[PDB]
Amino acid sequence: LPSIQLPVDYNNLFNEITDFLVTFKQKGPKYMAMLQKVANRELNSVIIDLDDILQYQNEKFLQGTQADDLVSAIQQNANHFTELFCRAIDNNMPLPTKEIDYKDDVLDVILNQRRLRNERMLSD
Amino acid sequence: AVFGDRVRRFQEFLDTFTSYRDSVRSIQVYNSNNNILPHRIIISLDDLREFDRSFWSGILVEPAYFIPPAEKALTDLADSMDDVPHPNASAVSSRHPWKLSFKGSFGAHALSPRTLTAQHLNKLVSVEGIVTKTSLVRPKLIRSVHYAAKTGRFHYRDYTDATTTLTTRIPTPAIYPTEDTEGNKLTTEYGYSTFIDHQRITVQEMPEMAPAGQLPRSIDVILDDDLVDKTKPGDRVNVVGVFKSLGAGGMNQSNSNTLIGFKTLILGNTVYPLARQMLTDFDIRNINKLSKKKDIFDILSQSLAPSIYGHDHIKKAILLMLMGGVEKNLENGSHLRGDINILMVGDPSTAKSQLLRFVLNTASLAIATTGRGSSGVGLTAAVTTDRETGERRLEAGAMVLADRGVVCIDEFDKMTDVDRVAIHEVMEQQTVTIAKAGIHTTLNARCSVIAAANPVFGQYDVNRDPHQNIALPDSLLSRFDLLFVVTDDINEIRDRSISEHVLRTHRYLPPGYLEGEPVRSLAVGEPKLVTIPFLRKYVQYAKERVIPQLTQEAINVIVKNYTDLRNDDNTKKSPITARTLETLIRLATAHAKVRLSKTVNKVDAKVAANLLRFALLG
Amino acid sequence: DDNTEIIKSFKNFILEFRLDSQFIYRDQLRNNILVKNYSLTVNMEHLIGYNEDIYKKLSDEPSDIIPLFETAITQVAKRISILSLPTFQLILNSNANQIPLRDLDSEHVSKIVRLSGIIISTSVLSSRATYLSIMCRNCRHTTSITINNFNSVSLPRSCLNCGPDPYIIIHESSKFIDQQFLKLQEIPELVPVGEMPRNLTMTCDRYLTNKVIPGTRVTIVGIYSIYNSVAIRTPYIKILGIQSDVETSSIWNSVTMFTEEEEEEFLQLSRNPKLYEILTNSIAPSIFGNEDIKKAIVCLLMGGSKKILPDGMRLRGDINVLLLGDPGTAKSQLLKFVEKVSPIAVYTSGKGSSAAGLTASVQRDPMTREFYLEGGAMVLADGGVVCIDEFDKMRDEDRVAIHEAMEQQTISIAKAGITTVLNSRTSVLAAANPIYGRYDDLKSPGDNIDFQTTILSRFDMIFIVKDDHNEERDISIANHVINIHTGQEENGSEISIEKMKRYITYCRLKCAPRLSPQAAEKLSSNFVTIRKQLLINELESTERSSIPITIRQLEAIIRITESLAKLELSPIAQERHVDEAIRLFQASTMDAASQ
DNA sequence: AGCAGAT
DNA sequence: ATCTGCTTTGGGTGGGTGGGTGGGTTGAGGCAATT
Ligand SMILES: Nc1ncnc2c1ncn2[C@@H]1O[C@H](COP(=O)(O)OP(=O)(O)OP(=O)(O)O)[C@@H](O)[C@H]1O
Ligand SMILES: Nc1ncnc2c1ncn2[C@@H]1O[C@H](COP(=O)(O)OP(=O)(O)OP(=O)(O)O)[C@@H](O)[C@H]1O
Ligand SMILES: [Mg+2]
Ligand SMILES: [Mg+2]
Ligand SMILES: [Zn+2]
Question: Whose CA, among B101, B591, C120, C326, lies 20 to 30 Å from C531?
Fold first, then answer.
């Protein structure tokens, strides 16, 4: 399995994605508000507007801090960026604002019991 | 060792002839400015023969060992030329080497599907024939690029098949690598992988060149990358490629036959059409000068089928049919056709079939069908399965294959009602609707129909009304712009004239032959009667760059003629209708096309009126 | 061990065999290598004469010794042509008794046999391997294999770890040959009682391919063998030689298969002052009278000449003849003779025929599920004559399916995706009966003929044969037939079927006369008079003529003139032929129309 | 490649 | 526990001494019964 040196580094792209999600504004940041709605079980679909990414890139360039071309990278290879964006959102999901019935969900109980079992195993 | 030497020898050839370098540079510049030209170059085998005889002989007789070196040399030259500042990651990962295509003169390798034998395997050949089938285009995996998240480095894998290269290699299954050499997880990067298109076509021997009592044969061809959709069924092509064999051919113990041969086929390098004539400035100026004449219509009409005596008006109608009308579709949805349909009914031996055959030969696109030889499915389309992919699809029929052309139907009255319904639908709507095998679609069939039929009793009877003389439905009859009824009336002067004409025709001898000698290429790349080639050029020019528009004067002429024609005591061989108005407008537009005019004038209306009056009231 | 001795023995036959003062096989080999025909035809009577032991081996185990006689030929060819070349093919000729196709059974397996039959189908050429270059998947070790096509071979199962079947063929370094498949049907007369004719599969190699066409009688020398496709094997014959009475190669390409000595005979025969009489008398020697029909059949066999005008129009060059008449006239016998004299011919009954049976039919391959085209009677008879008997029993649709192939000489198909225009250049000779079985003079001619004017106008000459009871003629016919029943001129008044067929082929491929101006003026005046005669006859009777006279009849007269000229290898047609053509037209078609 | 069997 | 070995998808690179109540389904052509 030989190797090549492509002119793409996913670390700078991941940092750019995180900055775009946490800082972009068009009220508070648009995508942070959408994530807030997602956390409260209101919303179940996050749509990323490439227009917003282009606007953010050009604003960064105008500020002088030029960065990597995110829109072209997404267009040229889009399967990877779904996972990258999902990871970025997972990292920055805000805490819920409205109380919900966690015990009703099967997964919450199952994962709580998994945590308890892991704690018991570690204590041994 | 030898490969590098050959690459150097081909590189020295490309240096000596600068046309290929200039073409490569122009292609690269055009790509940089930008829809996108492929990485292919046409080299003349004659120049290679003049430069180095051994290399030319090797490329013609051992292409496997001589074409890859030349392709690599060309790719190296192109890379040395390239000056793109920033390469996109896809471009860096892309596997797009330059491909080589040939022209010139093949001495004894110019063959046909019938003459290709086992002696020609592993050689560069050129084959001519008709394309009869065409599979669906499916991408083919060549290179895959992966990313190791932990290691932060990309890897790649190269795949090869029996039909993607000229030298035999170990087969590579299409399984994508999942784990790195050290056990890291690998995620495929599709956007950086390389896939190329792939299609398989069948080329059939020309029917007219076949031996006596033998059906034509065919050969399978493969086209990859930029040669994928350069041909459609019913096209005349000249294909250049390498004749190969594949598989184990029964040498594996699984097949117990012991009497089956190897598979064979051609990997194409070039495709050369054999349909549109390229017009020169001299030809265009001659066309215009002729069109300025006041009797151009008569000259062009007479030039059609010089060996058929009489039938002036039918020839004029055939000319107007070759030129066609102007197609208009309205916003509301009404779609007015600009095609002219013609029906000939008459007594036996009146030159109807010969006129059909002449129209078949002259017209740019024309398909031949008869009454008892066709079928409802064979005219519209058939449901079959694709050998390459095993997917359900449709095969175009006679009417669909002749899209934007002409279809000649001989023995129109010998068809069946079930088969007549398909033609009724096609002429009425100009489309084909198909509901079979879970397929719902609408194929476009915009063609002009010229047909010849015989009366019910085999000979037109004046006493009986036209309805009793023709067995076709009235609805089907109303869809023909011009109905010509031709009768063989015995006369002295006419008989002497026709007999003398026939005798003169039968005494022709083609140049290059002796008396009593029964009648039987060099390169691949490449009141006076008007010759047929010039007639074709004229028709192409006129129907390609003229769109006449009506004018109030032609409008007055047409309305007057329609008004007088409909309410007139004299009987008509066909019943007047509002469709006659559309036919009048269509004929006027076509005649305006003949003169190379942007507007329809009084003269065009008066010509259309005279033609329709002759058709209706003799 | 023994193989080298066998090879040495067959090499000494090719180098030591002289019947007088000429080395027949050494000289045959040199002459064949000079024109690039790598083969040697050996007569088995000569081998039985040199050493009978060599014949005993070649006949006891044919598929083991034949491969060792090919290598001997190759070695001798190298010695004779190269001053210090694929394996040479061996073609065999024998005069042993022919085994009937249906008598081949388990007692003849792996033996040399001679048999005759009719070829019904031929396959598209395949490619068989003769020298493979192979490589190993794992260790990449290169090797080669050599194969002879005589089966009792596969890639090595174990390399030379490497798993089973480690070798892959390197195609760009291998060499292949040609292979063809043929279906052989037994002759109609040989078939036993109440049995359908039986087929047999055959395969030929290299220089024995593209030697036959469907529908031609052939004689085959080969090996009756078996190949596995439970404990049964499907038999087949491995051809070692083909002999035919038809020069198919000349017929498909140029003029060939005529020796200068044979060619000289044809010119001498053409120079005969009265060749027309000899040919007329040579057709149906056993049928009394009917001289005009025999002359018409001579003209039909000869054919006219076809022209391709600069504008592209093609003019038919074949002649179509219809025989309408009463029973017992010997129309069917004339058709059965014409089928037997013509180089290519098919005899079909209008009743037992169909539109697809004639022309071509669309068929589906059960394996590939793909439609293909199979030729019918008019394709199988291409370049020859079709004898459609019982023309009146044919259905209206099946008869209508013949118009284009009779006039335009093409078969347009548009069915199951397949869209083409085949070629069918055939002459139709039809026999029919009137409506009432006998031509009844009391009723008008429009009542005795149910054929439409369109189909009738396509026939060049129409013969209305009427049987009149005349005592003198009746006595003559009785004497002739009794002589036939109770009972060889060959003295310049008649030529056998074989010679006549060869002469027809020679004339067709050698001559194509053209009309001179005088003939043109004569034919043109005659056409004007005939058309006037039909009009005077029509004006007299309200009824419209049932036998038409259109331009096709003018072209038919021209074709008859050209055939009469071609009969004598005359490059130009003069008035002496126009007069005969006009006489024949008046004797057949104007005679039919007058009634 | 998954599963079925012999050492 | 390890080494050795067969067979798919569905399709003619298994077949017709396995058949069509084991699935691969439209197109053409011939025949009896219906007209
Ligand atoms: N006006 C003509 N000039 C020259 N040849 C003619 C003319 N009319 C008929 N012919 C001759 O008629 C011959 C055959 O007639 P053709 O097939 O053209 O007639 P058709 O109208 O199609 O007849 P059918 O009703 O039998 O199909 C051709 O060889 C052609 O030479
Ligand atoms: N010179 C002859 N004239 C007529 N018949 C003959 C002659 N010589 C032999 N025959 C007999 O003619 C019979 C063949 O029938 P023939 O071909 O005459 O029928 P046809 O008239 O063409 O057909 P159909 O009676 O069905 O209309 C054979 O029995 C043959 O013996
Ligand atoms: Mg016709
Ligand atoms: Mg008979
Ligand atoms: Zn090995």
Answer: C326
Same domain for B117 and B257, yes or no, is: yes
Resolution in A: 3.2
**Mapping DSSP to helix (H, G, I), strand (E, B) and coil, where does residue C196 land?**
coil
Q: Please state, in angstroms and rounded to a whole number, the distance separating the CA atoms of residues B15 and B51.
A: 11
Output the six-digit token pair for C296. 């018409």
Say how far apart CA C249 and CA C211 lie, in whole Å: 7
User: Do B64 and B167 meet the contact criterion of CB atoms below 8 Å apart?
Assistant: yes
Mutate to test the interface with B, among A77, A79, A82 (most CBs of B within 10 A): A77
Distance from the first to the final alpha carbon of chain A: 44
Rounded CA-CA distance C41/C25 in Å is 8
| Count of CB atoms situated within 10 Å of the CB of B405 | 17
Domain range for C462 is: 260-593
Locate tokens 């390409």: which residue? Answer: C253
Within chain A, strands assigned E span 3-4
Range B328-337, long-range pairs (CB < 8 A, 24+ positions)? B335/B430, B336/B582, B337/B430, B337/B446
How distant, in Å, are the alpha carbons of B175, B215, B219, B241 from that of B111?
40, 17, 12, 12
Sign of CA dihedral C72, C76, C79, C82: negative
Q: Are C391 and C432 in contact (CB under 8 A)?
A: yes
Nucleotide nearest to C362 (CA to C1'): E28
CA–CA separation, B258 and B252 (whole Å): 10
- CA dihedral in degrees (C282, C285, C290, C291; nearest 10)? 30
B166 shares a domain with B122: no
In three-state secondary structure terms, B159 is coil
Q: How would DSSP label each residue in B184-220?
A: -BEEEEEEEEEEE-EEEEEEE--GGGS-TT----EEE
Residues 6+ apart with CB under 8 A from C454: B348, B454, B458, C403
As a three-state string, the secondary structure of B63-88 is HHHHHHHHHHHHHHHHHHHCCCCCCC
Q: Is the dihedral of CA A114, A118, A119, A121 positive or negative?
A: positive
Picking from C68, C123, C581, the residue whose alpha carbon sits closest to that of residue C365 is: C123
Are residues B121 and B260 both part of a single domain? yes
In the numeric block, the tokens 């369109």 are attached to: C454
- Say how far apart CA C410 and CA B210 lie, in whole Å: 13
Which residue matches tokens 């869209």?
C419
B 201-230 → C contacts, CB under 8 A: 207-208, 210-217
Distance CA C485, CA C480 (A): 9
How was this structure determined? It was done by cryo-EM
As a whole number of angstroms, the distance between CA B194 and CA B157 comes to 10
Cα gap B145→C254, rounded to integer Å: 60
Contact (CB, 8 A) for B50 and B13: no
Tokens of C39: 């083969």
Angstrom distance (rounded) from CA B467 to CA B573: 9
Q: Which domain holds residue B173?
A: 140-196
The pick from C412, C551, C555, C558 for probing ligand 1's pocket by mutation, whose C-beta has the most ligand atoms within 8 angstroms, reads C551
Nearest to B12 by CA among B55, B58, B67: B55
The radius of gyration computed from the CA coordinates of chain C, to the nearest angstrom, equals 30
C-alpha A123/C-alpha A116 separation (Å) is 11
Report in angstroms the alpha-carbon separations of B553 from B188, B567, B578, B588. Answer: 70, 22, 20, 12
Please report, rounded to whole angstroms, the spatial distance between the CA atom of protein residue B587 and the C1' atom of nucleotide E30.
47
C-alpha–C-alpha distance, residues C254 and C247, integer Å: 11
Domain harbouring B52, CATH code: 3.30.1640.10
Residues B49 and B175 in one domain: no
Kindly state the tokens that stand for C373.
């085209």
Domain shared by B119 and B215, yes or no: yes
Task: Please judge whether C315 and B505 are an interchain contact, meaning their C-beta atoms are less than 8 angstroms apart.
Answer: yes
